[PDB]
């Protein structure tokens, strides 16, 4: 699913997904905590991307709706 011609709506959701994925934490393991990418692929697999994109989509939906209610998008 994609916005109706809005490039600003795309930046909020993608940035939210990237920020959530970089700032996740499962079992004390995190990209921000200084814990490498390859073993987080090894330890979690696609669960890492799925959980990160799910929480990032929730955060991006909240941010997009808030900035729409205030005024921007």
């Amino acid at each position: 699913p994609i916005p109706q011609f809005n490039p600003a709506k795309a930046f909020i959701m993608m940035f939210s997904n990237i920020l959530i994925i970089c700032t996740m934490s499962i079992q004390g393991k995190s990209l921000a905590r200084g814990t490498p990418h390859d073993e987080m692929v090894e330890s979690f697999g696609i669960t890492w991307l799925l959980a990160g994109t799910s929480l990032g989509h929730i955060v991006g939906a909240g941010a997009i709706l808030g900035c729409t209610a205030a005024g921007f998008l």
Partner: protein
């Protein structure tokens, strides 16, 4: 052991050499999570549906139409057939085949240790033969038909136009058709 498709990603451990269609292409490592026979079931069902969908879409767009059907394009054919009230009747063969074949086959894929593979419905009435070369042809045509139907629907919704599904017909496919004078002006 790097993958054949992605030369810098490591090879997925669940795709060794069997299961025709194996190009070593599995990022996301979805074979570890989804069982591999279930994924082949889903892939070949999508492939067959997409092949029939591509041929039906192109055939209706080219002008072929059975008696008493609405003579419309394949974009409006769905709404026309729903308005006529017969498009619900297509569900009964679909319900028959899908329930009475897929549901026990999916349950036996998930539960039974010895079971037929994904696309193996053992249909084969004429007896062409399910060779390893023919399975590769089936799955290559199916992946091509999946991408093809995606493109056909997305372009036909944008243009509302004839068979090439471009904004200017086959002239968009062939740039030498369109005003080679400008190309000659820089030689």
């Amino acid at each position: 052991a790097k993958s054949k498709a992605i030369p810098f990603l490591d090879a997925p451990p669940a795709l060794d050499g069997t299961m025709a269609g194996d190009k070593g292409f599995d990022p996301l490592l979805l074979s570890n999570v989804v069982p591999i026979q279930w994924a082949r079931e889903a892939e070949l069902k999508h492939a067959r549906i997409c092949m029939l969908a591509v041929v039906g879409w192109v055939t209706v767009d080219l002008g072929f139409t059975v008696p008493y059907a609405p003579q419309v394009s394949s974009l409006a054919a769905h709404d026309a057939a729903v308005d006529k009230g017969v498009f619900l009747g297509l569900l009964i063969p679909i319900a028959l085949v899908e329930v009475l074949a897929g549901i026990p086959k999916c349950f036996q894929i998930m539960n039974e240790p010895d079971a037929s593979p994904g696309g193996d419905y053992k249909f084969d009435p004429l007896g062409i033969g399910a060779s390893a070369e023919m399975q590769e042809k089936e799955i290559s045509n199916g992946r091509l038909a999946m991408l093809a139907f995606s493109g056909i629907v997305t372009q036909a919704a944008l243009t509302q136009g004839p068979f090439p599904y471009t904004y200017n017909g086959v002239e968009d496919l062939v740039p030498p058709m369109q005003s080679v004078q400008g190309a000659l002006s820089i030689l």
